[PDB]
Amino acid sequence: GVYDYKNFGTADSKALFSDAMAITLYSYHNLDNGFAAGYQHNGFGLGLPATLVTALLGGTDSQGVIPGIPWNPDSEKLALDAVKKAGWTPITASQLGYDGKTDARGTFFGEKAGYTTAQVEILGKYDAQGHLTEIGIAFRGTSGPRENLILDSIGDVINDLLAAFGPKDYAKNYVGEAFGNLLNDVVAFAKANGLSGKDVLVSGHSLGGLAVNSMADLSGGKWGGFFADSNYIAYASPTQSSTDKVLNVGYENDPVFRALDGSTFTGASVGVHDAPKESATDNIVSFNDHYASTAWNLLPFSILNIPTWISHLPTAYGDGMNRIIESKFYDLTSKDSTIIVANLSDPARANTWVQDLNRNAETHKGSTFIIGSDSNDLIQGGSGNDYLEGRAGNDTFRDGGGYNVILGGAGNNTLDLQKSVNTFDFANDGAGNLYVRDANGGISITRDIGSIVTKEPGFLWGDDVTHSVTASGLKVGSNVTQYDASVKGTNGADTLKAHAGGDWLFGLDGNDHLIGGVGNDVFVGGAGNDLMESGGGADTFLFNGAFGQDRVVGFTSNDKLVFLGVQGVLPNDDFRAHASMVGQDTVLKFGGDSVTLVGVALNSLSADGIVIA
Amino acid sequence: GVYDYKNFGTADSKALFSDAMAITLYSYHNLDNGFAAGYQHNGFGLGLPATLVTALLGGTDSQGVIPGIPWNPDSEKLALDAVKKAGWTPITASQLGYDGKTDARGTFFGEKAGYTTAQVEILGKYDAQGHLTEIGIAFRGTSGPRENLILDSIGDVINDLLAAFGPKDYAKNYVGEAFGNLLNDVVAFAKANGLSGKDVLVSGHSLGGLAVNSMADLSGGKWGGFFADSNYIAYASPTQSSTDKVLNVGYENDPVFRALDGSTFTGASVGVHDAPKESATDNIVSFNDHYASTAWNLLPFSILNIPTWISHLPTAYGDGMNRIIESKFYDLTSKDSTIIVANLSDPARANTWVQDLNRNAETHKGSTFIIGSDSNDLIQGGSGNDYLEGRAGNDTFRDGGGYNVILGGAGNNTLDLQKSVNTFDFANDGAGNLYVRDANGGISITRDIGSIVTKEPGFLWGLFKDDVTHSVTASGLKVGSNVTQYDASVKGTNGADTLKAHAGGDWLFGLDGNDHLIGGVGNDVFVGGAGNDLMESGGGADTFLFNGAFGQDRVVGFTSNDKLVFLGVQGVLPNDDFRAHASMVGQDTVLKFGGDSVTLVGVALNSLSADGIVIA
Ligand SMILES: [Ca+2]
Ligand SMILES: [Ca+2]
Ligand SMILES: [Ca+2]
Ligand SMILES: [Ca+2]
Ligand SMILES: [Ca+2]
Ligand SMILES: [Ca+2]
Ligand SMILES: [Ca+2]
Ligand SMILES: [Ca+2]
Ligand SMILES: [Ca+2]
Ligand SMILES: [Ca+2]
Ligand SMILES: [Ca+2]
Ligand SMILES: [Ca+2]
Ligand SMILES: [Ca+2]
Ligand SMILES: [Ca+2]
Ligand SMILES: [Ca+2]
Ligand SMILES: [Ca+2]
Ligand SMILES: [Ca+2]
User: In DSSP terms, which residues pair with A560 in a beta bridge?
Assistant: First the structure.
């Protein structure tokens, strides 16, 4: 998964992640709530003035920067309710025996001159019998309490500037100078509750992402080494620690994120700074109204260009990245997977195609994941290999080519092929998958998409035609575009045999024996350990999901293997990364799943006969 | 005067400038009205969020950036009405026979791709019979009509960036590209009406300042040389044309003003770029809440720090610089005079002293002018020479020493000396001038200050200090039963007088008329006043005060232990010493200040020393 961490598996990494996000969101106390709401209703162009009104005064359903407006919700109490729902309760200065500053909310404040506008939250996770099981440490980014916002922010900005322009280790020592004492009292508190360093999660966003990396840098030497094996997940940090301890998560179009290298100011710092970084997720795009805008991007991408900071705001971090966590494609992803997160306003969502523009960023490689919203989206895949997820709402998909998985989600979803129905082949396995094969051999596996739009010039001489996806073909009323010749199996073990003319063969679940003929067949073994025999001709073998340990017989020169939505594909992996000889057979391994090409020598294979997506 | 332009002289360059400002303000259509009104109420600190709310939404007495809010006044009708009160009526596309684009307000829009967000107003002044007498051309700075604010602003800023980072001469050609055809129609429309270039005023703020400079650069060679003798007054321009045609007016703490040199982006462009520039007013400060604030100024001054942009906003340009135009000190000032303008919010004004902090600027030289508001101000003159102006409102002054003029204005005004009354001498000519002399000989001439505050030794034998308020009366400073006496005086009349000092030493007040002031062996202070006066020392260590239009005077007996003091006199350029004003005429040294002069009978110029001739 993109957020895999240390040697925690997929699931434990995600749980860690969601906690870090939750405690990071709490540390801001819903300050950008008003912005988020104003933006969602108004956008970031014509209606940007109105978005900004809401950023300051919120509305009936949001609180902006100004406190005590009666018709606003109590966003701060919602912020506390939210963190508790996640399992976290602030630990009082009283429980730690801390003699430093806190405010009425229990927020801890930096200890030394020049660090007094620093903020951190210390939080506990308690079990059923009420024992402490985990400590959360969330460092607040730039900004402070609504009561002292401007003055507090000015302090933070001096600190930010010192990170870039001051003592060489300024950023590294930030947490030592700000919370050295608080953290000794935290070490004592954990000990007293039977907790070690492994039971501590450290998070924060922006300046607080800097703090995360600071503590990681200091953790080997300070606090008696107690925090050395703690969990560090930082969001939108300008810096990266010199350790291997920190997961640095951000949107590649957030200009704050990785602004420094790892704390060095460079020429890149005030422009695009998108070089690959070991600690960072390199390729996550917040597809927001700014990113999508042609007008906005006539201006230079720069941390100095304030409008670009929309991509920095923490609510879109929490909302967009949560949907990456929930995604059906999640386990396909890794740290540097290209992922496009639908983050448009309501009015831009109505007329803007979410797509990989690759704006202001190094060239994206490998497959692309586009993650929709729970509202009606317009999603456009590229000409390469795509994973498009609609989620809820009535979504419409386009895609430019290659090898794709398109999941409609809930709602009434539509795939717009933009071309004549006659340039495609359709098949359906009877188990919720519609296969679309285009004139170039690219295959899309589609689910929950009930309408296909095609352009028919020589029926509508100037021309969209809408086909329903049914068990008997694609239908325009009573008129049928037939699926390609198929043999459908069951979720039991089946023997399936192709006709001489070629068939799509659908094992579905169970260990199936698929017997090709002299024709060009398409083999979909399905889940389970399948035996597939070519029988001659130019055959396609397609592998998707947790496909099993398959055996392929009679595979030749003119045959194609297709891997799509399978485990362990690093950006731009080719077949060689997954292939070995075992005996006389070539095996291709994808996570725990495998294909054995019986009697085929590794050296006879060509990347053009082997598609990895 | 600070805004003297070409050879129009004091008064006509003032009226020119007020015209330039009036049309510059119109071009913005009151876009910053809600900010100005928000700032005045809330300030720029704790109140900054509320200030921005008003900037966007206005209120019941202002319109912010957002159109169509029921309870706002029509700030765009107010702007039209204001430009009309100023004499101007926008000229229509039909009158010009212009085939380009205009919007519902008559505003003209740029002509070519990449200039479509440029805006200009073309206006006409008409006489009593309705004949065109003048054309005004007012280019809009960054921003556009409210209906399209953001997208229009993005275009403008792209233009700003190309001014710095684009083709050489991008700024020079901007008006050529944006409005080349419009200008041809304007030439033809002016010729049609009997006008030449000299009847054209060109103005604009920010990017419109850049546009003033572009048009000046191009005027020689384009549109047939027609506007080569036009009038060019640019506000807050980041650039300066390569010509001698443009008055570049700006606040020195405005980060946009002079950002480029004169079109070149340098290291200083992103910081302080306060180098003297021939075409520009180098030393005018907007004393606003940002400038005042120690916390804000922790942050580096840069066009890249958006808060510093408070000093850029047009209403504070119109309002501050109008007070400059109106000042009783106006005609003392020149292009590079140090001038501090009171621009504080209502909450900042009650507790912040207006003073020359010299923040984020080259060291200020010469006398300092501090201009107040029509509210109650706190004004702090420096240890050098100051001209302090309260205007209306109940004002309070402090001043750190030197030679000063302090005009209280209307209201109940107070001079706070911050030390014992015993360290000052006081004199009064009976004509409204109260003179305050400190322990070092520094003189302040004050008018319309009815209260003097002193800090006196108090309880426990001076451990504690008392603040005592004295009333200025005919017989002295008075506190209850205690009178602080004026220094011994002889007062003349507004006709010709002969006045004689007693040997103990007197202040000799000639007043109007040509007076004969006879000093004695004591230390006298001579104030010939208006008219041509004859003043003889008599010996001792004497002081001769010259202020205003002091006439042609003759001083006899001036020696090495005497002192001349020029205060509030014409033609003192920043940091002038006497040598810029001194010549020999036969046996006599002559000092000249505009049309006024002092002749030091039989003193040789080369025996003089700056110690004995104070110029302020
Ligand atoms: Ca803070
Ligand atoms: Ca990237
Ligand atoms: Ca694709
Ligand atoms: Ca959706
Ligand atoms: Ca859907
Ligand atoms: Ca089966
Ligand atoms: Ca199977
Ligand atoms: Ca076959
Ligand atoms: Ca299988
Ligand atoms: Ca504009
Ligand atoms: Ca200056
Ligand atoms: Ca002074
Ligand atoms: Ca006043
Ligand atoms: Ca007289
Ligand atoms: Ca006289
Ligand atoms: Ca004498
Ligand atoms: Ca005289």
Answer: A540
